[PDB]
Amino acid sequence: SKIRIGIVGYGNIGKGVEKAIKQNDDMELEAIFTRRDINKVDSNNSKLVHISRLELYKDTVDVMILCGGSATDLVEQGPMIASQFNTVDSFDNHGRIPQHFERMDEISKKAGNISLISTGWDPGLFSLNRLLGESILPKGKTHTFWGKGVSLGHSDAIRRVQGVKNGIQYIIPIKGALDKARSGEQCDFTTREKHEMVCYVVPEENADLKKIEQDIKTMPDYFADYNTTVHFITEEELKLNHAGLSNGGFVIRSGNTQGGAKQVMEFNLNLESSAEFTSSVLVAYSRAIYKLSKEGKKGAVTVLDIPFSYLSPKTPEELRKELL
């Protein structure tokens, strides 16, 4: 009697979900729904099933994990899947979450299913800690930094600069800003003080390195506001040391108690593989959604509504005995 999981999208995240499931004995992978012609994408990968056949699994999948491979799926179609299954997604457009919730709630609701939106680390785990922090320390500041990680957008930008063969960009929290937050001295940070950007560029033969550097550093919207460093490297080093699959970040609540005493709470992640971690979180929440659906819960939910006890396959007593 294991939890039957369905995967939609076979990009890095779906690949990770399939992986995570192996680390979860109480779960089985029923199928991987893809758009690519399964016929040519091998056949020994017995779990692969074409997206056109999704509906045929309406009764064999307990939780459908949406790992949409960037397109219309990775934002629009989950609503179509919620109409048929209990789902879990990591919709990451913070500004549009209120709307995504509205829509998903209606569907999952009248369909009698349950849909979990925006889980992962941010949104997801960082969200939970932002809430915990301001809930426990009502008087204070909340600072979220996004650990060393790539920005697809900024990388494409770098590529539009004259004389740039190829390149990559990283956003990195500034240590000095972290140290001050970690100290109880409450304060607000300017954009320039929280994060710095680091680019590794492969120049064309003869290109005007100093020009490229400034073209990137003074680039409006993307870099103008941040201290940016440009390192020039070869195509070999680019491929070897900048796969760009890692990430991390910090959530810090710097506050004071009534008497004025300093109190600091911090939560952070260091991810060698950002995608595999997100997937692991997706799977864990799948366990929670399964329980919830069985309890007969309906509508859309966020990690903000789920007790941590639901993320574990252990019983209530085992937890209170082992972890409390």
Ligand X SMILES: CC(C)C[C@@H](N)C(=O)O
Binding site for a copy of itself (CB under 8 A): 16, 19-20, 22-24, 94, 97-98, 101, 118, 123, 125, 127-132, 134-139, 182, 184, 245, 257-259, 261-273, 276-277, 279-281, 284, 302-309, 311-312, 316-317, 319-321, 323-324
Distance of alpha carbon 25 from the chain centroid:
24
151 or 309: CB nearest ligand X: 151
204 or 308: CB nearest a copy of itself: 308
> Closest Cα to residue 270, out of 246, 251, 234, 290?
246
228 or 286: CB nearest a copy of itself: 286
| Nearest-CB residue for ligand X | 153
- The one of ligand X, a copy of itself, none whose footprint includes residue 118, by CB under 5 to 8 A per kind, is a copy of itself
In Å, what is the CA distance from 24 to each residue of 29, 43, 222?
Answer: 10, 25, 41
Helices (H), the chain: 12-22, 78-82, 97-110, 125-136, 152-159, 175-182, 191-194, 209-217, 235-241, 274-294, 316-322
- The one of ligand X, a copy of itself, none whose footprint includes residue 284, by CB under 5 to 8 A per kind, is a copy of itself
Strand, helix or coil for residue 295: coil
In Å, what is the CA distance from 136 to each residue of 129, 140, 250?
Answer: 10, 10, 18
CB of 238 to ligand X, least distance (A): 18
CB of 260 to a copy of itself, least distance (A): 9
Q: Are 238 and 169 a contacting pair, CB within 8 Å?
A: no
60 or 257: CB nearest a copy of itself: 257
CB of 149 to a copy of itself, least distance (A): 13
153 or 313: CB nearest ligand X: 153
Residue 78: phi and psi, rounded to 5, are -55, -45
Q: What is the contact surface with ligand X in residues (CB under 6 A)? A: 151-154
Element (H, E) at 255: strand 247-256
- The one of a copy of itself, ligand X, none whose footprint includes residue 132, by CB under 5 to 8 A per kind, is a copy of itself
Look at the block and give the residue holding tokens 């829509």. Answer: 103
30 or 122: CB nearest ligand X: 122
> Strands 149-150, 164-173: parallel, antiparallel or unpaired by DSSP?
antiparallel
CB of 152 to ligand X, least distance (A): 4
- The one of a copy of itself, ligand X, none whose footprint includes residue 123, by CB under 5 to 8 A per kind, is a copy of itself
Strand, helix or coil for residue 151: coil
CB of 93 to ligand X, least distance (A): 8
